[PDB]
């Protein structure tokens, strides 16, 4: 909307390292950002592109889940929601959900039902405290889905790291419940947590995301891949993230 709604220009006062992951990105365009907790350092492929703000799409379900937990819309004993019989094109959406199944299968209606219960003033307060991108709530409907609210790839990392790692307003039990819903892979070497997002505009992919974090025995890393062109889907952003993280030594 405004002059600053499409970019993040705040300096990184940290140590940062330029990466070249162009061979992994291939015919896709976008950026990758990682932050290491132990190093207090950022690692960025395509820094210019990492500061452009895009709709977060389904990655904002991270924040809707945290808000839903914070406001006691869902909890640790019961995060179940019944299906209202509206037919969806995916069978995984046509059934009862809890936080885990909704996050895993990116069930939009579950998060929409959460958002409907959240008053605009609370969201505005939270996006301000979190420094969430352009903080633009617009019409306040599905404002995170190809709409007013935009965030950069660099901000996806900073905002998620700060939300989880600072001693703040969100409880440890909420943070733990969200983490459980985001767990993708666990083995002897690492735990990988994350969430995809895919935007579709006029039948074409236009905006792919995979935002998450890795816990190893030595460190914790927050990361995000954004795709703006080529085949810009969440699925592809996840594949790219895994290839990059592997090369960097984060996954062993």
Annotated active-site positions, please? 58
Q: Is 100 in the site for ligand BOU (CB under 6 A)?
A: no
Q: Is 200 in the site for ligand BOU (CB under 6 A)?
A: yes
Q: Is 58 in the site for ligand BOU (CB under 6 A)?
A: yes
Q: Is 30 in the site for ligand BOU (CB under 6 A)?
A: no
Task: List the alpha helices (DSSP H) in 118-212.
Answer: 120-130, 153-165, 172-182
Structure tokens given for 8: 């993040």
* Nearest residue (CB) to ligand BOU, 19 versus 66: 66
C-alpha distances (whole Å) from 36 to each of 116, 172, 202 are 35, 21, 38
Q: How far is the CB of 168 from ligand BOU (least distance, A)?
A: 26
Which pairing describes strands 29-36 and 220-229: parallel, antiparallel, or unpaired? antiparallel
What single-letter DSSP state applies at residue 7?
B
Structure tokens given for 249: 């030594």
Q: Is 31 in the site for ligand BOU (CB under 6 A)?
A: no
Report the Cα–Cα distance between both ends of the chain, in Å, rounded.
43
CA distance 25 to 50: 14
Among residues 30, 68, 194, 199, the one that binds ligand BOU under rule CB under 6 A = 199
Q: Is 194 in the site for ligand BOU (CB under 6 A)?
A: no
Residue nearest to ligand BOU (CB): 58
* Nearest residue (CB) to ligand BOU, 30 versus 234: 234
Site residues for ligand BOU per CB under 6 A: 57-58, 89, 106, 108, 145-146, 196-200, 234
């Amino acid at each position: 909307q405004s002059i600053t709604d499409y970019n993040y220009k705040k300096p990184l006062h940290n140590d940062y390292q330029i990466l070249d992951k162009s061979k992994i990105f291939g015919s896709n365009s976008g950026s990758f950002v990682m932050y290491s907790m132990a190093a207090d350092a950022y690692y960025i492929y395509n820094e210019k592109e990492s500061r452009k703000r895009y709709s977060p799409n389904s990655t904002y379900k991270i924040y809707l889940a945290m808000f839903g937990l914070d406001r006691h819309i869902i909890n640790d004993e019961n995060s179940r929601m019944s299906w209202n019989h509206k037919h969806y094109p995916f069978d995984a959406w046509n059934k009862e959900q809890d936080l885990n199944t909704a996050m895993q299968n990116s069930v939009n209606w579950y998060f929409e039902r959460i958002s409907d219960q959240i008053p605009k003033n609370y969201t505005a307060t939270q996006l301000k405290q979190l420094n969430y991108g352009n903080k633009n709530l617009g019409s306040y409907k599905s404002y995170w889905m190809e709409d007013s609210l935009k965030i950069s790839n660099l901000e996806q990392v900073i905002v998620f790291k700060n939300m989880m790692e600072q001693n703040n307003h969100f409880s440890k039990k909420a943070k733990n419940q969200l983490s459980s819903s985001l767990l993708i892979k666990k083995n002897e070497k690492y735990e990988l947590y994350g969430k995809t997002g895919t935007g579709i505009v006029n039948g074409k992919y236009n905006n792919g995301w995979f935002v998450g974090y890795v816990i190893t025995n030595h460190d914790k890393y927050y990361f995000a891949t954004h795709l703006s062109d080529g085949k810009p889907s969440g699925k592809n952003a996840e594949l790219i993230s895994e290839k990059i993280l592997k090369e960097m030594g984060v996954l062993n």
